[PDB]
């Protein structure tokens, strides 16, 4: 019998509880709208896009999904036959939360599902550049400064510049604002959980069971879970408190990764009792090299120990939209 926090960090929808508190919704209670049902036969599977112990995501072709006589590339999340009922429930619950959330430009969107007969298939948008973290890392050496000739890079047209990084930061804040408006808390926001598509649109996601979490050292064995500690707010680490404001903390850590072009957070600071002490005492990362001062300012406010002093995603969107206008 699996403890699911060992295998993924589940997003949560919250509902108003007593007084000013929120409580988690049990996602198995959410409805699955059968308008999403899509014939299993009209799918043709290609390469695997990610896999963990019990789940995988694989690229596929779907016949007639969006237009009656047209095919389109999609990504399909599904479980391996060795999965347990606890994973099969988690995947249906993920489908129910997707059916509840609706559609947004900056999330990986639900396109359809196969829920009768064999395994649950969750059909979502395919993003051809893959995860943003790997993209930033392979694009790292070709990042180009403002007033520099295009002739110095080979693929200057495919290179990375500050305009891209500000754009990615803006689109992720917009996706997170959407999530928060549906009372959704992601709980595992990070560049590894953001995809990049045609036109360089970023889409938030979570590989979840399709990630080999035991071999991703960004997840630390803490209690009986595997937790992305370096991305988490202190209240989540120490009191297991997850709110819209803890997502903002993670967004600040994402910004640091983004403007460091995929560097790993808190270098020279392995997760141990020393790490936890320094975070409590107010240690915070310095500005990434390519981060403009105003983006580093957002980062610092994202990391306020007092959750009420952190920006909301709605405010962050306003801030970054203005920074983009002014340049
Ligand atoms: F809305 C959000 F909160 F952002 C959200 C959306 C979806 C999910 C979980 N659903 C999924 C499903 C598949 C994937 C992986 C994936 C897809 N399209 C892709 N295109 C390319 C590649 Cl290489 C990987 C993928 C990630 N998350 C979690 N959170």
d(CA 136, CA 255): 12
DSSP annotation of 183 reads T
Is residue 188 part of the annotated active site? The answer reads: yes
d(CA 187, CA 32): 22
- Ligand 1 site-directed mutation target among 87, 91, 98, 108, most atoms within 8 Å of CB: 108
SS3 (DSSP) at 317:
helix
Q: Which of 97, 98, 92 is nearest to 114 (CA)?
A: 92
Bridge partner list, 112: 123
Bridge partner list, 202: 196
The residue with tokens 């975070």 is: 279
Which tokens in the block code for residue 246? 């803890």
Q: Which of 12, 188, 205, 191 is nearest to 106 (CA)?
A: 205
Cβ–Cβ under 8 Å, residues 194 and 188: no
d(CA 188, CA 250): 8
What superfamily in CATH does domain 2-126 come from? Phosphorylase Kinase; domain 1 (3.30.200.20)
In a 10 Å sphere around its CB, with 0-12 CB exposed, 13-18 middle and 19+ buried, how is residue 22 labelled?
A: middle
- Ligand 1 site-directed mutation target among 124, 186, 194, most atoms within 8 Å of CB: 124
CATH code assigned to 127-327: 1.10.510.10
Resolution to one decimal, Å: 2.2
Options 141, 147, 188, 212, the catalytic residue: 188
SS3 (DSSP) at 324:
helix
Which are the contacts of 286, defined by CB distance < 8 A and separation ≥ 6?
A: none
CATH 1.10.510.10 region(s) of the chain?
127-327
Cβ–Cβ under 8 Å, residues 194 and 132: yes
Cβ neighbour number for residue 8 with a 10 Å cutoff: 25
Q: Are strands 22-24 and 12-16 parallel, antiparallel or unpaired?
A: antiparallel
- Ligand 1 site-directed mutation target among 45, 57, 121, most atoms within 8 Å of CB: 57
Bridge partner list, 244: none
d(CA 106, CA 124): 13
Which tokens in the block code for residue 168? 């990615």
Q: Ligand 1 centre from 126 Cα, in Å?
A: 8
Which tokens in the block code for residue 147? 């007033």
In a 10 Å sphere around its CB, with 0-12 CB exposed, 13-18 middle and 19+ buried, how is residue 20 labelled?
A: exposed
d(CA 75, CA 105): 16
CATH 3.30.200.20 region(s) of the chain?
2-126
Question: Helix, strand, coil % (nearest 5) of the chain?
Answer: 40, 20, 40
Q: Which residues contact ligand 1 via a Cβ below 6 A?
A: 11, 49-50, 57, 75, 77, 94, 107-108, 124-127, 130, 179, 186, 195, 204-208
Bridge partner list, 51: 56
Residues, the chain: 327
d(CA 159, CA 142): 6
Q: Ligand 1 centre from 274 Cα, in Å?
A: 34
DSSP annotation of 40 reads G
Query: What would the 3-class secondary structure string for 86-145 be?
Result: HHHHHHHHHHHHHHHHCCCCCECCEEEEECCCCCCEEEEECCCCEEHHHHHHHCHHHECC
Which tokens in the block code for residue 327? 């340049």
Rg for the chain, CA atoms, rounded: 20
Cβ–Cβ under 8 Å, residues 14 and 21: no
Cβ–Cβ under 8 Å, residues 219 and 228: yes
Q: Ligand 1 centre from 6 Cα, in Å?
A: 19
The residue with tokens 């997760």 is: 271
Q: Ligand 1 centre from 207 Cα, in Å?
A: 6
* DSSP conformation letters of 229-254: GGGS-HHHHHH----HHHHHHHHHHH
SS3 (DSSP) at 289:
coil
d(CA 107, CA 35): 20
Residues 265-272: contacts with CB under 8 Å, at least 24 apart:
265/230, 265/231, 266/230, 271/220, 271/222, 271/229, 271/230
Specify the ligand 1 atom closest to the Cα of 186: 3
Bridge partner list, 185: 12
Which tokens in the block code for residue 45? 């599977």
* DSSP conformation letters of 244-285: HHHHHHHHHHHHHHHHTTSPPSSTT--SSHHHHHHHHTT---
Ligand 1 atom 9, closest CA: 206
The residue with tokens 């500050």 is: 162
């Amino acid at each position: 019998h699996h403890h699911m926090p060992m295998y993924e960090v589940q997003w949560k929808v919250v509902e108003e509880s007593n007084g000013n508190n929120y409580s988690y919704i049990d996602p198995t209670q959410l409805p699955y709208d059968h308008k999403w049902e899509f014939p299993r036969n009209r799918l043709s599977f290609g390469k695997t896009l990610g896999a963990g112990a019990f789940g995988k995501v694989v690229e596929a072709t779907a016949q007639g999904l969006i237009k009656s006589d047209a095919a389109m590339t999609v990504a399909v999340k599904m479980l391996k036959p060795s999965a347990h009922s606890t994973e099969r429930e988690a995947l249906m619950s993920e489908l129910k939360v997707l059916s509840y959330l609706g559609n947004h430009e900056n999330i990986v969107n639900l396109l359809g599902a196969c829920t009768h007969g064999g395994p649950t298939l969750v059909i979502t948008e395919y993003c051809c550049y893959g995860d943003l973290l790997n993209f930033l890392r392979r694009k790292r050496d070709s990042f180009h400064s403002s007033d520099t000739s295009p002739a110095s890079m080979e693929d200057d047209e495919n290179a990375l510049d500050l305009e891209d990084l500000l754009s990615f930061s803006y689109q992720v804040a917009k996706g997170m604002a959407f999530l928060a408006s549906k009372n959704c808390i992601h709980r595992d926001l990070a560049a590894r959980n953001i995809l990049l598509t045609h036109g360089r649109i970023t889409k938030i996601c979570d590989f979840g069971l399709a990630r080999d979490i035991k071999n991703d050292s960004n997840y630390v064995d803490k209690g009986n879970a595997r937790l992305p500690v370096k991305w988490m707010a202190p209240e989540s680490i120490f009191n297991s408190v997850y709110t819209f404001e803890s997502d903002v903390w993670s967004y600040g850590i994402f910004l640091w990764e983004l403007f460091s072009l995929g560097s790993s957070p808190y270098p020279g600071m392995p997760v141990d009792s020393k790490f936890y002490k320094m975070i409590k005492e107010g240690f915070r990362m310095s500005s990434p090299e390519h981060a403009p001062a105003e983006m580093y300012d957002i980062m610092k406010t994202c990391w306020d120990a007092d959750p009420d002093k952190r920006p909301t995603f709605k405010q962050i969107v306003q801030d970054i939209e203005k920074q983009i206008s002014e340049s």
